[PDB]
Amino acid sequence: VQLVQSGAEVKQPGASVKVSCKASGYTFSDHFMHWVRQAPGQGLEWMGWINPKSGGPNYAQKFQGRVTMTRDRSISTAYMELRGLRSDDTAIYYCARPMHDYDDHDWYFDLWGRGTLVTVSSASTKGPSVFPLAPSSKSTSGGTAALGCLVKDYFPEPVTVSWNSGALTSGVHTFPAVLQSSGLYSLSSVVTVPSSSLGTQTYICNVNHKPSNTKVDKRVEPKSC
Amino acid sequence: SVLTQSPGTLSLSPGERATLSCRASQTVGSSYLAWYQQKPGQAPRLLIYGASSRATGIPDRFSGSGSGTDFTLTISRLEPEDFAVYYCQQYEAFGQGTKVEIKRTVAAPSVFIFPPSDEQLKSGTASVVCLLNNFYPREAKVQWKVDNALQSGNSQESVTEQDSKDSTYSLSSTLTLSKADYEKHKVYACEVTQGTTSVTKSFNRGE
């Protein structure tokens, strides 16, 4: 009993994307296949279902005319094709299988797929620009110092930030990335350390952006002001 | 039907009873409701099917009930793994969701401010970071003031999840400006307001 889906894809605005969902561990034709997307931070949004036997689907009125749900009974794989992709179509697209019900109410989704990340953007891949959040008198409050790194203007997700090659983990907060008006993500990672160790211990943030194959190490040197 | 859930932020300590709500007003009484639990990076997991029937593999602490339009999902005792978002479903409609959060004593944020780095100023972009460290609850109002003038639309903010140790929140607030606009003002500050308290950390551009 499993539901495997296609890998994550990135599409330009106005393009189309097709997502697969192969079924295992059960009879594919005995249950409907529903598609529900979830925007980042939003709730669940039902899109439509499709009958494996006949192939006649039913779409929500929001997606009507833009979604085409097909299936292949030979490989037990269902497909969802969304066209005219907009900037707000960036969401995780799941496939859910309703269970057999005593009252024949086939809407209790007990089996789910891991989801497919579909990102719609008009941006090109760019390496992160890492700037230092230098500790100073504006970040030293009673023996505690604050410092960090600003990971700005990178695309696409994700990035991984560590400190001292993973040796420093206590009091480290890496914020979730925010999508800027330029279409590039930007986050920042911070850490609080004793102000006595600013002049002796060295602190380096390690930003890794595998999509661009760029690995930036930045040394945060304390200021004197 | 239209499904509404409340409260969307139910902060409770571990080990006590949690009660959730789901209102299916735009329906008849279709006792065909369902309950789900979703954790970050994971797909929703079915908990309750029908009005009160427990799904297979769901522990006894989860239970549901309903009367016409008002439905409740109740957890008798809150386990550490029960702090997540919950959704209710009737046919194809989904509620806005309810987030169960660990309740802790009120903590004031540690407000730090970072001027734009000299390296970043060379590229024509200036970013000022306001840091709120280990506070509670998640509610907080951060306002940017440049030369005692409130800013609007030129800042973004992100919040970390509850820390695994102290169950606190950290909030970042970045003010993005150009080099030309940054050079024409001296005083920069962010005003953090939380529960009749307004801490304002400031700096001057030069110096």
Author numbering:
A (entry chain H): 2 to 52, 52A, 53 to 82, 82A, 82B, 82C, 83 to 100, 100A, ...
B (entry chain L): 2 to 27, 27A, 28 to 91, 96 to 211
The authors write:
In a double-blinded, placebo-controlled phase 1 human clinical trial, the recombinant, germline-targeting envelope glycoprotein (Env) trimer BG505 SOSIP.v4.1-GT1.1, adjuvanted with AS01B, induced bnAb precursors of the VRC01-class at a high frequency in the majority of vaccine recipients. These bnAb precursors, that target the CD4 receptor binding site, had undergone somatic hypermutation characteristic of the VRC01-class. The GT strategy for inducing VRC01-class bnAb precursors is rooted in the hypothesis that these antibodies target the CD4bs with a similar angle of approach to VRC01 and use the same conserved contact residues. To verify that VRC01-class mAbs elicited by GT1.1 do not just exhibit similar sequence features to VRC01-class bnAbs but also target the CD4bs in a similar manner and with the same atomic contacts, we selected five mAbs for further structural characterization.
Moreover, VRC01-class bnAbs have very distinct and targetable genetic and structural characteristics. Finally, GT1.1-induced VRC01-class mAbs are structurally extremely similar to VRC01-class bnAbs. A subset of isolated VRC01-class monoclonal antibodies neutralized wild-type pseudoviruses and was structurally extremely similar to bnAb VRC01.
